[PDB]
Design an enzyme around this catalytic site. Structure first.
Site, PDB file in Angstrom:
ATOM      1  N   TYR B  54       0.802  -1.220  -0.103  1.00 45.00           N
ATOM      2  CA  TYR B  54      -0.020  -0.041   0.151  1.00 45.00           C
ATOM      3  C   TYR B  54       0.868   1.284  -0.109  1.00 45.00           C
ATOM      4  CZ  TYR B  54      -5.262  -0.317   0.182  1.00 45.00           C
ATOM      5  OH  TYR B  54      -6.586  -0.415  -0.169  1.00 45.00           O
ATOM      6  N   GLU B  56      -0.251   4.668  -0.837  1.00 42.58           N
ATOM      7  CA  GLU B  56      -1.132   5.965  -0.981  1.00 42.58           C
ATOM      8  C   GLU B  56      -0.313   7.246  -0.821  1.00 42.58           C
ATOM      9  OE1 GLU B  56      -5.635   5.438   0.542  1.00 42.58           O
ATOM     10  OE2 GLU B  56      -3.995   4.467   1.922  1.00 42.58           O
ATOM     11  N   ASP B 209      -6.784  12.587 -25.868  1.00 42.24           N
ATOM     12  CA  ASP B 209      -7.016  11.208 -25.531  1.00 42.24           C
ATOM     13  C   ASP B 209      -6.243  10.409 -26.579  1.00 42.24           C
ATOM     14  OD1 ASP B 209      -7.904   8.974 -24.303  1.00 42.24           O
ATOM     15  OD2 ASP B 209      -9.801   9.630 -23.846  1.00 42.24           O
ATOM     16  N   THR B 235      -4.458   5.081 -22.286  1.00 40.61           N
ATOM     17  CA  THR B 235      -4.337   3.893 -21.839  1.00 40.61           C
ATOM     18  C   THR B 235      -2.676   3.600 -21.695  1.00 40.61           C
ATOM     19  OG1 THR B 235      -4.922   3.135 -23.858  1.00 40.61           O
ATOM     20  CG2 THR B 235      -6.612   3.056 -22.290  1.00 40.61           C
ATOM     21  N   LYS B 238      -3.759  -1.306 -25.444  1.00 39.21           N
ATOM     22  CA  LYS B 238      -3.837  -0.956 -26.944  1.00 39.21           C
ATOM     23  C   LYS B 238      -2.546  -0.831 -27.822  1.00 39.21           C
ATOM     24  CE  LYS B 238      -8.183   0.921 -25.482  1.00 39.21           C
ATOM     25  NZ  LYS B 238      -8.755   2.518 -25.490  1.00 39.21           N
ATOM     26  N   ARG B 244      -3.201  -3.198 -18.555  1.00 36.56           N
ATOM     27  CA  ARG B 244      -4.213  -2.305 -18.338  1.00 36.56           C
ATOM     28  C   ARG B 244      -3.823  -1.283 -17.151  1.00 36.56           C
ATOM     29  NH1 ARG B 244      -8.723  -3.952 -21.437  1.00 36.56           N
ATOM     30  NH2 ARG B 244      -8.142  -5.650 -22.573  1.00 36.56           N
TER      31      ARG B 244
HETATM   32  C1  8Z1 Z   1      -5.174   7.691   3.561  1.00 33.88           C
HETATM   33  C2  8Z1 Z   1      -6.229   7.478   4.280  1.00 33.88           C
HETATM   34  N1  8Z1 Z   1      -7.476   7.023   3.709  1.00 33.88           N
HETATM   35  N2  8Z1 Z   1      -8.594   6.495   4.588  1.00 33.88           N
HETATM   36  C3  8Z1 Z   1      -7.739   6.769   5.966  1.00 33.88           C
HETATM   37  C4  8Z1 Z   1      -6.685   7.161   5.626  1.00 33.88           C
HETATM   38  C5  8Z1 Z   1      -5.487   7.514   6.587  1.00 33.88           C
HETATM   39  C6  8Z1 Z   1      -4.929   8.916   6.712  1.00 33.88           C
HETATM   40  C7  8Z1 Z   1      -5.673  10.018   5.952  1.00 33.88           C
HETATM   41  C8  8Z1 Z   1      -5.260  11.127   5.700  1.00 33.88           C
HETATM   42  N3  8Z1 Z   1      -5.708  12.339   5.031  1.00 33.88           N
HETATM   43  C9  8Z1 Z   1      -6.348  12.215   3.691  1.00 33.88           C
HETATM   44  C10 8Z1 Z   1      -6.046  13.301   3.347  1.00 33.88           C
HETATM   45  C11 8Z1 Z   1      -5.433  14.427   4.193  1.00 33.88           C
HETATM   46  C12 8Z1 Z   1      -5.857  13.681   5.578  1.00 33.88           C
HETATM   47  C13 8Z1 Z   1      -3.822  11.456   6.444  1.00 33.88           C
HETATM   48  C14 8Z1 Z   1      -3.380  10.503   7.216  1.00 33.88           C
HETATM   49  C15 8Z1 Z   1      -2.102  10.766   7.954  1.00 33.88           C
HETATM   50  F1  8Z1 Z   1      -1.206   9.597   8.120  1.00 33.88           F
HETATM   51  F2  8Z1 Z   1      -1.450  11.635   7.288  1.00 33.88           F
HETATM   52  F3  8Z1 Z   1      -2.534  11.273   9.398  1.00 33.88           F
HETATM   53  C16 8Z1 Z   1      -3.899   9.243   7.292  1.00 33.88           C
HETATM   54  C17 8Z1 Z   1      -4.553   6.211   7.009  1.00 33.88           C
HETATM   55  C18 8Z1 Z   1      -5.139   5.124   6.757  1.00 33.88           C
HETATM   56  C19 8Z1 Z   1      -3.551   6.467   5.865  1.00 33.88           C
HETATM   57  C20 8Z1 Z   1      -6.319   7.544   8.017  1.00 33.88           C
HETATM   58  C21 8Z1 Z   1      -5.621   8.313   9.527  1.00 33.88           C
HETATM   59  N4  8Z1 Z   1      -5.162   8.324  10.347  1.00 33.88           N
HETATM   60  C22 8Z1 Z   1      -7.739   6.932   8.131  1.00 33.88           C
HETATM   61  N5  8Z1 Z   1      -8.292   7.107   9.203  1.00 33.88           N
HETATM   62  O1  8Z1 Z   1      -8.321   6.474   7.180  1.00 33.88           O
END
Ligand code: 8Z1
Ligand code: 8Z1
Lengths: 462, 462
Positions: B54, B56, B209, B235, B238, B244
């Site tokens: 993960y 994010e 696009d 994409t 293609k 994908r």
């Molecule tokens: C990215 C995310 N999606 N859903 C989430 C998150 C969390 C999260 C969101 C967020 N934010 C989303 C946009 C700005 C705040 C920030 C943080 C952190 F780590 F900086 F404190 C953490 C975490 C699982 C990574 C998070 C926490 N803490 C929670 N409770 O749920």
């Protein structure tokens, strides 16, 4: 050029990066509650020729031909999804095409709500997901809050639970068309019966977003959201241990019968949910993912998986009980699921500090906002999860041993904190100071030796 | 259970489905213009341990730790993306996280437009994509048309080309905030410079696009939309021949220095595009897909891939020429790209009929509306594409041979048309009638013998 050459032969740069990542996963202790380790069987399907097929539409109602096999794969992924959560095909249908969990949620909103219609979800710092609605004071963050109107429901800051009373109070005022029962960071079960009481009163839809707990629900080691929810969305990864993808389960058939009209009033979810996924939101299905999901969904039906799921709960309890017994406070005082929320404020620390120290010793967890958070910016907790290490055959003793490895990291964090001012200075100190550095380098080396000896799912070198 | 078992042993039912699909792909003539066959190298990355992480957020700015290797993979995929399309990193940036093409487009609209802001794209029956806007007479079909306000632009039915004059006329009235240059079913090159003039006039963003043509663009065998567009979406499958996924390219640095004030005006796409993908729309990246894309983007920089792309053009020309020589009519008269639009109305057959006959002899193409015909009428054209068979080392003679088989199928379709009335009669007569059934079986076996001899990119068995 055949396109049958190995990755190692044709792209050495990439192959080394995969080996570096595979080594990292093997040598580390994965405590992120959203992570798991996918089976080799699933990954083989994921890298199959099913990548080469465009099959826009649904089984028997495709836009192109040559779709006889992918139809059987999609229909099998549906059947296996229903089987895995013990659902009757006459009562439930399922969409297996969503690309991830976030797409699955947007598809549900798009399917059932008009733009700017009202949504209620658990607030983000209170353990909700971004996709349930999230706005700051200055901007709409989630796309859920851009295209729909979201109001968060909060936790009771005394009990650390979902304030079901205040939810019902605010819901009858705000009048949402959908309420979301699901969490990112919450150690207790949800009262889906209570959620449905509120949704029944205010005429709202109940969406269960079981992403985090979906494996536990299939294994029947916790109660099922499917008894009370209209719609269930989930990731196929996390506790289900599948490939990255999403599902949308929906009620179908008859909902209710009025004696006055003297006829059945059917559920109208199926056509709208399916239409919203395609043609409204997505393009070509990722059939390779669908097949990998179906492989994992078969795995989740087995006795093997149930015992893995019981072991997750035990290992979470063991991690919780071991933390309590070494002088740590837990949000909601423990756990009834795969994770534990560690309030580090009562032991004089925060989440951001703990996170970076643990990371340096190959222990990966994430910072977390607790109810007792005095400051809104710097988070005062830690989310630790069982599922990953449990998939590597970790038992309770192994989890008690990682708690001891963590506690040593926390105690370095408490020592570095007291010899430091800021959070910026806190990270400078760890990298630069030889005495902290070498005391971390020693702790890492032990953690890696401990972790490496356990088995790892998937392929051997990548 | 180790999670290190093979799919074949672990899930035999899924394994047999993969094997049937591999056989179908190997024995077929794939003429769907959106299809290709992915390299084994790319598919290996796709089914790797990168599925387990993960990540994010973005490189160096993640929400969890332990992301040092996936950071290198994402940054590598970005570098290779800019290199594939010969872009200056000072002038262009790229987001590599979109889960597919359709997500990439929605991220752009979300990033740059307010809900209900105006978009213009080529109408769907005129050869645009669903994600460019589509509404029927009674319903908003694309999510682009639900959350934003779409009005299509049309072809000139005399030439089969985009009516750039009428676009300029209608855009001055409609006042779109964004105009999309890109197609799904179009045999000719888009006048991106003229699209740019219309955009500059009405103060609209130009989105290219390039999904269908991206490989051709990377290979430098046709003109690049990057010389005229603000944003480019594509994409990764293609003509790029990867897994994908999707990409969003965007201008960065200085837009224009205002000589009255003196100061440089910046491009403001980067932060908005990146925020729209995450956190607004998507959750965790599909790092496995990102790595596979990086492999394909690397392949697309090579001499091999240029030679592949030149061959795709030559093969499409050859197919066009071979169709002209046998008395077929082509929409716009021919092709300057990877695909050919056949108009079957002059020969007295439609696309729905041809498509089904061709499907029963292992030739997969799709029906396509011809300019002037309303979308409610049964489509009188057929889309045919070179990239997939060109990846199996087909050359010009082989595509002439492909046209022979198509022609036989068309001629079978003509004979079955004279013996039936409706479409459900036609389609069933192909299955039920003895003489027709035999003639198809003969042709099918000849098509399949022909196709099987050519090499297939990917793994041997699945
Ligand atoms: C990215 C995310 N999606 N859903 C989430 C998150 C969390 C999260 C969101 C967020 N934010 C989303 C946009 C700005 C705040 C920030 C943080 C952190 F780590 F900086 F404190 C953490 C975490 C699982 C990574 C998070 C926490 N803490 C929670 N409770 O749920
Ligand atoms: C699904 C899709 N997305 N983008 C598309 C399509 C096409 C398409 C759209 C559609 N529609 C989408 C919603 C209803 C119409 C129908 C058809 C068909 F085959 F039935 F004619 C074809 C095609 C490439 C599959 C299509 C056609 N014809 C065009 N031009 O572009």
């Amino acid at each position: 050029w055949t396109g049958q050459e190995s990755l190692s032969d044709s792209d050495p740069e990439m192959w080394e990066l995969l080996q570096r990542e595979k080594d990292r996963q093997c040598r580390g202790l994965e405590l992120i509650a959203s992570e798991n380790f996918c089976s080799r069987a699933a990954l083989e399907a994921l890298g199959s020729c099913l990548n080469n097929k465009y099959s826009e539409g649904y089984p028997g109602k495709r836009y192109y031909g040559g779709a006889e096999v992918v139809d059987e794969i999609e229909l099998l992924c549906q059947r296996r999804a229903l089987e895995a959560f013990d659902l009757d095909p006459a009562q439930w249908g399922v969409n297996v095409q969503p690309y991830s969990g976030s797409p699955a949620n947007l598809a549900v909103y798009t399917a059932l709500l008009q733009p700017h219609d009202r949504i209620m979800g658990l607030d983000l710092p209170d353990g909700g997901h971004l996709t349930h609605g999230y706005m700051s004071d200055v901007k709409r963050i989630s796309a859920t809050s851009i295209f729909f109107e979201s109001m968060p429901y909060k936790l009771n800051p005394k009990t650390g639970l979902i304030d079901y009373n205040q939810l019902a109070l605010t819901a009858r005022l705000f009048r949402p068309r959908l309420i979301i029962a699901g969490t990112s960071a919450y150690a207790r079960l949800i009262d889906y019966a209570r959620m449905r009481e509120v949704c029944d009163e205010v005429k709202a839809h109940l969406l269960a977003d079981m992403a985090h707990i979906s494996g536990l629900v299939a294994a029947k080691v916790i109660p099922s959201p499917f008894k009370h929810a209209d719609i269930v969305t989930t990731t196929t990864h996390k506790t289900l241990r599948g490939a990255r993808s999403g599902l949308i389960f929906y009620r179908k058939g008859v909902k209710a019968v009025d004696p006055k009209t003297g006829r059945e009033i059917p559920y109208t979810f199926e056509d709208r949910i399916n239409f919203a996924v395609f043609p409204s939101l997505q393009g070509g299905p990722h059939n390779h993912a669908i097949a990998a999901v179906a492989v994992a969904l078969k795995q989740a039906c087995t006795p093997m998986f149930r015992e893995y799921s019981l072991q997750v709960l035990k290992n979470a309890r063991a991690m919780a009980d071991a933390l309590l017994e070494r002088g740590y406070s837990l949000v909601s005082g423990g756990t009834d699921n795969h994770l534990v929320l560690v309030d580090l404020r009562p032991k004089g620390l925060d989440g951001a500090r703990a996170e970076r120290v643990l990371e340096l010793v190959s222990i990966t967890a994430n910072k977390n906002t607790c109810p007792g958070d005095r400051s809104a910016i710097t988070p005062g907790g830690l989310r630790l999860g069982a599922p990953a290490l449990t998939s590597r055959q970790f038992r309770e003793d192994d989890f008690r041993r990682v708690v001891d490895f963590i506690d040593e990291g926390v105690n370095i964090g408490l020592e570095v904190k007291s010899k430091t001012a800021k959070l910026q200075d806190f990270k400078s100190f760890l990298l630069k100071d030889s005495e902290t550095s070498q005391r971390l380098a020693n702790l890492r080396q032990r953690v890696e030796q401990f972790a490496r000896a356990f088995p790892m799912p998937g392929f051997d070198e990548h």
